[PDB]
């Protein structure tokens, strides 16, 4: 008999956003058994072999589940969540439209679009800085190249499986 916050992390009443992914520190079959998945196989590790740990819980879009992989390049990978190429971790996603989607969409969920410094792996930047530096920072949104770092995806039942919501816990065993 062993207890871990993994049931708390996965079955979380409210998940965290991608820009601020909730970070917490055996038997892991309950993680893969409790819900059918669209993508759970470990990228950079073996699904069966998983059974310091950093449980990074957030919601990601169905088309972006593949984006959370070692060496992958994209919007989520470059800025939101960058992963080291030599990292041993598993990405686990299940379509939870029944749980975290909402009539009219669940907009509590956010992600970081662009940070000028390509995000170093395992690094979280929470600051609401308007898009950084450039020829003219201007400290305010009155023109181009100065965007708020945050955008949110609505989560509706009518959305397609690609746009439907997935509670991904990018656990990086170390």
């Amino acid at each position: 008999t062993n207890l871990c916050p993994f049931d708390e992390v996965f079955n979380a009443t409210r998940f965290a956003s991608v820009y601020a992914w909730n970070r917490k520190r055996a038997d892991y079959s309950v993680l893969y058994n409790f819900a059918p998945f669209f993508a759970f196989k470990c990228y950079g590790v073996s699904p069966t072999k998983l059974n310091n740990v950093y449980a990074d819980s957030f919601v990601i879009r169905g088309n972006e589940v593949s984006q959370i992989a070692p060496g992958q390049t994209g919007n989520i990978a470059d800025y939101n969540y960058k992963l080291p190429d030599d990292f041993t971790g598993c990405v686990i996603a299940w379509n939870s439209n029944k749980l975290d989607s909402k009539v009219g969409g669940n907009y509590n969920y956010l992600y970081r679009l662009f940070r000028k410094s390509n995000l170093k792996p395992f690094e979280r930047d929470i600051s609401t800085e308007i898009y950084q530096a450039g020829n003219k920072p201007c400290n305010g949104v009155a023109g181009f190249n100065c965007y708020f770092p945050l955008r949110s995806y609505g989560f509706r039942p009518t959305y397609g499986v690609g746009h439907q919501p997935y509670r991904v816990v990018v656990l990086s065993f170390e």
Partner: antibody, heavy 126, light 111 residues
């Protein structure tokens, strides 16, 4: 089927102390951030306060005009929203309004209405 | 946060457009989410109120398209395409960014 009603109003001399209740059923009471609003006879609804869900800390808010004299609580067995009154001063509507945007509830709904609104109880002061 | 409706009492005939403007002291729009935190409730005389719209744009299910809303920043509006016999009620624009503040309340009636 969901329904929201209240009872217990009546005439009371100023200065007393009592409690008021509301009745709920047919929906997931625990998740929603139910609250209580009051409407004076011939006036508009004034936000008495909000009682948040236990998962979200259960924090209780109140408005300044009624701050320090009222208290809104919760119970699960009776599915009942409460509004106790202390130091009465010269119609009350239990609700779940303003909750869907913070509470964690799925898109499935009892009928499709995520709002729930009380019958309304008139409380008169001498 | 002080909430004010425009006006305190509105008159709209059968089926005409019913626009109810809302104004708030602070800024309700969340910079992160890029959408506002607003609602709209109608209260028929004598029985429970009901919710017209949420997020200042989204529509209640079970009620057809004549309900319409659009808000940005600290200025909000709910516009009703057609007013029916049961649609007659008294309205309360609401914000939930910090606490919840029903305004003075706008009552609509058949002209």
């Amino acid at each position: 089927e969901v329904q929201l009603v209240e009872s217990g109003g009546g005439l009371v001399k100023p200065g007393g102390s009592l409690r008021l209740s509301c009745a709920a059923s047919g929906f997931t009471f625990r998740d929603v951030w139910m609250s209580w609003v009051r409407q004076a006879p011939g006036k508009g609804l004034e936000w008495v306060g909000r009682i948040k869900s236990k998962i979200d800390g259960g924090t209780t808010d109140y408005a300044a005009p009624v701050k320090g004299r009222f208290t809104i609580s919760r119970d699960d067995s009776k599915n009942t929203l409460y509004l106790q009154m202390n130091s009465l001063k010269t119609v009350y509507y239990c609700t779940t309004a303003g909750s869907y945007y913070y509470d964690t509830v799925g898109p499935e709904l009892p009928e499709g209405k995520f709002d729930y609104w009380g019958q309304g109880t008139l409380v008169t002061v001498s | 946060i002080v909430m004010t409706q425009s006006p305190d009492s509105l008159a709209v005939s059968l089926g005409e457009r019913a626009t109810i403007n809302c104004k708030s002291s602070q800024s309700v729009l969340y910079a992160a989410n890029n959408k506002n935190y607003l609602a709209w409730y109608q209260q028929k005389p004598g029985q429970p109120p009901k919710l017209l719209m949420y997020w200042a744009s989204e529509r209640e299910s079970g009620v057809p398209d004549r309900f319409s809303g659009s808000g940005s920043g600290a200025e909000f509006t709910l516009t009703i395409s057609s007013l029916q016999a049961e649609d007659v009620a008294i309205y309360y624009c609401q914000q939930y960014y910090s606490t919840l503040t029903f305004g003075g309340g706008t009552k609509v009636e058949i002209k």
